Design a protein around this ligand. Structure first.
Ligand SMILES: *S(O)(O)Oc1ccc(OCc2c(F)cc(-n3cnc(NS(C)(=O)=O)n3)cc2F)cc1
Ligand SMILES: OC[C@H]1O[C@@](CO)(O[C@H]2O[C@H](CO)[C@@H](O)[C@H](O)[C@H]2O)[C@@H](O)[C@@H]1O
Ligand SMILES: OC[C@H]1O[C@@](CO)(O[C@H]2O[C@H](CO)[C@@H](O)[C@H](O)[C@H]2O)[C@@H](O)[C@@H]1O
Ligand SMILES: OC[C@H]1O[C@@](CO)(O[C@H]2O[C@H](CO)[C@@H](O)[C@H](O)[C@H]2O)[C@@H](O)[C@@H]1O
Ligand SMILES: OC[C@H]1O[C@@](CO)(O[C@H]2O[C@H](CO)[C@@H](O)[C@H](O)[C@H]2O)[C@@H](O)[C@@H]1O
Ligand SMILES: OC[C@H]1O[C@@](CO)(O[C@H]2O[C@H](CO)[C@@H](O)[C@H](O)[C@H]2O)[C@@H](O)[C@@H]1O
Length: 468
């Protein structure tokens, strides 16, 4: 018997819905799928659909009806999806598919990807004021999972994350950024599962490790929530008492791990927080040393960027918190993974499905305290055959780090699939995510992207639903 949705959440939700009702309805993004055993035949189907869609009868059919009909075809080896708001975009996109040409709304491949997708759970640097709000108001499944995490977090820390999502006046801090991005991560992944997708493996960075543990079957939703709540509040409370000589900055520098080993001989107190990309590393330490290594970087033409925090996670400054984190996590129950795990806590090494559990109290201490081996995990995934990396986040920050490691590992055409992004319609974005999973042959029931038909006008007069 968990807490319910707070009264203030409901209040904020009613105001938000009026805000939504009084806005101009935008044309939805529809996925149009064509496929064939042969790419040559796929291109002809795309040309035939474009022709019919140019005809008066095609023009008279809604995109949603056309796409619902396409979704009931057999789905062949060679695939394409044209994402469209109207008949113009669709016909344009289909002509590109027919012509073998690239367009920004078009995905087309000769055959499925060989290995299943890696779900990427990062989070840092992805937050913004209204993250998750639009999809909450507009997707029943997304909203159900948000509320499930909101009840658990309510019960664990005593406040409502859903109030933060719904109230535009409020913005996120070191604590609430983590628990709220977690909630968005859980809800995005369960929405994806709802339409048939699943992770082949998971990889986490810093914040996202708790969600990655849930989706890998290493911890119940309750214990994953305990993992992100204890981490988050200790970090925010600890960092707020940091002043003067106790302050520790974090910064991004264009140095590799090997460069760092040599550059750090001038900086005794600097530590590595995150190995982000082959030539991007996040360091932490006392402000004067951080300022000097930044100065050193910019003098060598390398770029460098100070983050906004008075404390540095994944350094020794976390040693005061570990005792309390240990106490708060007593009772969690680590379970055997149900998909692969690239563990950026354990130096980037792989854990097979059915392996021994890894997510014990010591795992969360080690993760908070020690470096995040993100680029090593990604490289390990590339080297064992993975090419599709799907990021669950309000903004696709980590995907840019993945691109750097995949290109550097020789993979020059990875499938980098984002989810949400500020200033992209959150329902469009999720359509596009699931349309890509389909093109590459990953698990996804494209039929579930369209509501159940309730009448013959929900179909179009094309195969497989031609009217007798
Ligand atoms: S944990 O507590 O959440 O700690 C943690 C994890 C990950 C972090 O870094 C994420 C990150 C990153 F690795 C790189 C960038 N990035 C690349 N390029 C730029 N901008 S610039 C100066 O080239 O124009 N920024 C950003 C980012 F958030 C940090 C802490
Ligand atoms: O939602 C827009 C509109 O609603 C008002 C109340 O009429 O404020 C509601 O929404 C705000 C944004 O989330 C909240 O901060 C506020 O608490 C809530 O009452 C208007 O002030 C606003 O223009
Ligand atoms: O501890 C002395 C030792 O560390 C250096 C490294 O640059 O400085 C740091 O330690 C000081 C405390 O003694 C701090 O005041 C300072 O913020 C920190 O960078 C040198 O002073 C020396 O090699
Ligand atoms: O501030 C100077 C410092 O910045 C760098 C880039 O990190 O250069 C920029 O500033 C110079 C002065 O305006 C410009 O001439 C240069 O084109 C610009 O990139 C460093 O090279 C320099 O040390
Ligand atoms: O102030 C640094 C800035 O000055 C330039 C010349 O505009 O370089 C000078 O300073 C360097 C030391 O930082 C010397 O190595 C160099 O010989 C001298 O010309 C810029 O190149 C630099 O960004
Ligand atoms: O080829 C089968 C393979 O395709 C996916 C999507 O990548 O599912 C499609 O094919 C199914 C029929 O085999 C349809 O039920 C489904 O609607 C369609 O997306 C994968 O999920 C499936 O393994």
């Amino acid at each position: 018997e968990l807490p319910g949705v707070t009264e203030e959440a409901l209040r904020l939700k009613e105001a938000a819905l009026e805000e939504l009702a009084a806005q101009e309805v935008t044309a939805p993004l529809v996925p149009l799928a064509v496929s064939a055993f042969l790419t040559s035949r796929k291109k002809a189907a795309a040309a035939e659909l474009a022709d019919w869609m140019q005809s008066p009868e095609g023009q008279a059919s809604s995109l949603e009806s056309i796409g619902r009909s396409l979704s009931r075809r057999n789905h062949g080896r060679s695939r394409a999806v044209v994402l469209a708001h109207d008949h113009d975009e669709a016909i344009k996109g289909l002509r590109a598919v027919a012509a073998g040409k690239q367009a920004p709304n078009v995905f087309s491949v000769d055959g499925p990807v060989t290995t299943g997708p890696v779900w990427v759970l990062a989070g840092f640097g992805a937050q913004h004021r209204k993250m998750g709000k639009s999809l909450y108001l507009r997707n029943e499944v997304f909203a159900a999972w948000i509320e499930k995490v909101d009840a658990l977090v309510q019960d664990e820390l005593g406040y409502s994350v859903l109030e933060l999502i719904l109230d535009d006046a409020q913005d996120y801090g070191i604590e609430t950024t983590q628990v709220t991005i977690f909630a968005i991560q859980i809800a995005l992944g369960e929405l994806l599962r709802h339409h048939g997708a699943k992770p082949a493996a998971v990889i986490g960075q810093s914040l996202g490790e708790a969600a990655s543990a849930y989706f890998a079957g290493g911890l119940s939703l309750r214990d994953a929530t305990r993992a992100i709540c204890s981490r988050s509040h200790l970090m925010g409370e600890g960092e707020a008492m940091l002043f003067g000589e106790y302050i520790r900055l974090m910064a991004l520098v264009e140095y590799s791990a090997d460069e760092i080993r040599e550059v750090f001989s001038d900086f005794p107190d600097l530590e590595v927080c995150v190995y982000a990309a082959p030539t991007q590393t996040v360091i932490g330490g006392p402000p004067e040393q951080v300022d000097a290594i930044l100065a050193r970087a910019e003098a060598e033409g390398k770029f460098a960027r100070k983050f906004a925090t008075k404390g540095a996670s994944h350094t020794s400054q976390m040693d005061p918190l570990l005792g309390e984190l240990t106490a708060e996590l007593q009772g969690i129950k680590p379970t055997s993974p149900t998909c692969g795990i690239f563990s950026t806590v354990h130096e980037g090494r792989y854990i097979k499905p059915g392996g021994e559990p890894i997510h014990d109290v010591e795992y969360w201490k080690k993760g908070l305290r020690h470096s995040v081996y993100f680029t090593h995990g990604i490289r390990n995934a590339v080297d064992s055959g993975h090419t599709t990396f799907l990021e669950l986040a309000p903004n696709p920050v980590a995907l840019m780090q993945v691109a750097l490691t995949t290109a550097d590992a020789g993979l020059h055409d990875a499938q980098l699939i984002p989810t949400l992004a500020r200033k992209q319609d959150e329902v469009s974005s999720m359509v596009s995510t699931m349309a890509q999973l389909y093109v590459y042959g990953h698990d996804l029931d494209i039929r579930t992207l369209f509501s159940r038909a309730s009448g013959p006008q929900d179909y179009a007069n094309i195969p497989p639903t031609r009217f007798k």
